[PDB]
């Protein structure tokens, strides 16, 4: 086994952890267990704390500093590693008891429990003209020594390591996404039936999505074009609520469906980040510093969820639109386009 290690600027504190990515199984989150090595030679305050922080990092638009960022703590937890207060005695994990043995009594254990219905680590895509730190939701464990919780923490007597709350594809695949819609126009009782379905419910990052379309046009109108588009939804709930839909993959096929005739075709799209770099704010999976990460994985909420969950809640849907001729009695005033949507799960398979 191997553990991650990071020391403070002057080397008096050193944080140890078994892993960076702590999986969220919906029903439980992997606990953040580790130790903090502090030599007595440098321990003068005689109080070492460890803190887990889930904060949303953002930039203010009015301010033109070019890189300035701010944090807003969504969830924060505290564990007094030293001195061990008599009203807190916890059993060390296998991981922890291996570490003390290796290092010694100067390595004080800490263990945090991430509660359910908290956001996963999601970083919003920065533009090319963005030099600050990564914006979005990110988890951070910060160890420091201070006389009390009131005192101001010195950056040299402290060390911060970034960690990620992640999720993976369900082991059981969900039901095949299928959706239908029928539009009836006033000119006559002839309907325009649109039927669409995806190949599977779960899709891994960078995999092809096949859309089986079947249009049955009995109307006097003609389908000029067919626009398929994989769209990324992102519900952001911090101070009031924002949301957006953005096409990460699309295709504008000029397949015509003449009046009183059927049509059937399979379209294949594949979302990838290269042809989406210019989309500032596009949700991406959590970044430790500034590496390239894939498109944000769909976040899985509980069934009987609490709702109004903080952070960023990303989803995906495939929209199948039909651009219809319009005209006639009403002219081009009334819209005749018919569209239907198909939700699907996009995320990484569980690593073994």
């Amino acid at each position, epitope marked *: 086994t*191997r553990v991650f290690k990071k020391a403070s600027p002057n080397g008096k504190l050193t944080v140890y952890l078994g892993k960076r990515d702590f999986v969220d199984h919906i029903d439980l989150v992997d606990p953040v267990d580790g130790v903090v090595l502090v030599d007595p030679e440098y321990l003068k305050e005689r109080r070492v704390y460890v803190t887990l922080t889930c904060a949303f990092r953002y930039g203010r638009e009015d301010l033109d500093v070019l890189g300035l960022t701010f944090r807003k703590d969504l969830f924060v937890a505290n564990v007094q590693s030293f001195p061990p207060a008599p009203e807190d005695k916890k059993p060390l994990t296998r991981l922890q008891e291996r570490l003390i043995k290796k290092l010694g009594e100067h390595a004080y254990p800490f263990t945090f429990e991430i509660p359910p219905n908290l956001p996963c680590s999601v970083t919003l895509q920065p533009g090319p003209e963005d030099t600050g730190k990564a914006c979005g939701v990110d988890y951070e464990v910060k160890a420091f020594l201070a006389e009390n919780l009131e005192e101001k923490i010195h950056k040299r007597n402290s060390v911060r390591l970034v960690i990620r709350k992640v999720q993976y594809a369900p082991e059981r695949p969900g039901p095949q996404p299928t959706a239908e819609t029928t539009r009836q126009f006033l000119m006559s009782d002839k309907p325009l039936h649109l039927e669409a379905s995806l190949d599977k419910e779960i899709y891994y990052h*960078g*995999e092809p999505i096949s859309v089986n379309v079947h249009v049955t046009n009995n109307t006097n109108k003609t389908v000029k074009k067919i626009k398929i588009s994989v769209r990324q939804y992102a519900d952001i709930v911090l101070f009031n609520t924002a949301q957006y839909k953005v096409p990460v993959a699309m295709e504008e096929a000029d397949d015509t469906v003449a009046p009183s005739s059927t049509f059937s075709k399979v379209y294949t799209l*594949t979302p*990838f*980040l*290269a042809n989406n770099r210019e989309k500032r704010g596009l949700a991406l999976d959590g970044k430790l510093k500034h590496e390239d990460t*894939n498109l944000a994985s769909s976040t899985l909420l509980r069934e009987g969820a609490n709702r109004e969950i903080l952070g960023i809640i990303v989803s995906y849907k495939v929209k199948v639109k039909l651009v219809v001729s319009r005209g006639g009695l009403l002219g081009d005033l009334a819209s005749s386009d018919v569209a239907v949507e198909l939700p699907f799960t996009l995320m*990484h398979p569980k690593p073994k």
Partner: antibody, heavy 119, light 109 residues
Framework: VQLVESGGGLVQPGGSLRLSCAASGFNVYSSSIHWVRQAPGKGLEWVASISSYYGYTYYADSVKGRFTISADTSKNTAYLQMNSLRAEDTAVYYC?????????????WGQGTLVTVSS | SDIQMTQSPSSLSASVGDRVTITCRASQSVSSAVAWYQQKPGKAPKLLIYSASSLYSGVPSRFSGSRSGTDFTLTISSLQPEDFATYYCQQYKYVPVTFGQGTKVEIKR
């Protein structure tokens, strides 16, 4: 699943030659195609790599400026244009797939086409 | 100015049923990002082990790897007629990814 190489032969020094690697059973955007060079009895050497999901190219310093790695996603084939060729570059060139999420070695290789450079 | 891989053996000889170990020490700390390959004459290489210790799918359970600072080792519990070929150690933390010289494994007689 398979990787089919093509485009090998004899070319004089300074000339050019282009390789093709057709893929089957591998999604282009969930993979990263690689190129490896081995002379007879000399060992393996990485020369180039293409990441089609992020859209990035990588080359060994020896090859920087001389070769160029490309790929037609629609045709599921990865090409390598080799310009200003040299006798050093005489070798069997292998094509190797890699998992994009995430790199766990070079799980599959092709038989490799014989490339020979000499006057 | 690149990370090179040095396989400690040159040519290993052993009979069928032996426990063979191939050591490979990298130039600097490449973390647990190391792999091993097998190349028969006239054939392309096959991936054996990745992530220093993790075994690849379809590879027999006899092969196993282990990390030790900069030294990474490939091991086999019992040696079989299918295992007689050359071996290569790889690293893939930083680019360029480099390979070892090679260890000629052969049947004892």
């Amino acid at each position: 699943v398979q990787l089919v190489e093509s485009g090998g032969g004899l070319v004089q020094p300074g000339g050019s030659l282009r390789l093709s690697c057709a893929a089957s059973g591998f999604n282009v955007y969930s993979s990263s195609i690689h190129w490896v060079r081995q002379a007879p009895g000399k060992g393996l050497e990485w020369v180039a790599s293409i990441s089609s999901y992020y859209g990035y190219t990588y080359y060994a310093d020896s090859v920087k400026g001389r070769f160029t790695i490309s790929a037609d996603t629609s045709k599921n084939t990865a090409y390598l244009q080799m310009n200003s060729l040299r006798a050093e570059d005489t070798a069997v060139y292998y094509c190797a797939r890699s998992r994009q999420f995430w790199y766990s070695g070079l799980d599959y290789w092709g038989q490799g086409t014989l490339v020979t450079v000499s006057s | 100015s690149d990370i090179q891989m040095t396989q400690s053996p040159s040519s290993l000889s052993a009979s069928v049923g032996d426990r063979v170990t191939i050591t490979c020490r990298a130039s600097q700390s490449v973390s647990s990002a190391v792999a091993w390959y097998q190349q028969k004459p006239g054939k392309a290489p096959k991936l054996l082990i990745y992530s220093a210790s993790s075994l690849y799918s379809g590879v027999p359970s006899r092969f196993s790897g282990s990390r030790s600072g900069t030294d990474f080792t490939l091991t086999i519990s019992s040696l079989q007629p299918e295992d007689f070929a050359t071996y290569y150690c790889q690293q893939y933390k930083y680019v360029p990814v480099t390979f070892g010289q090679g260890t000629k494994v052969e049947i004892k007689r």
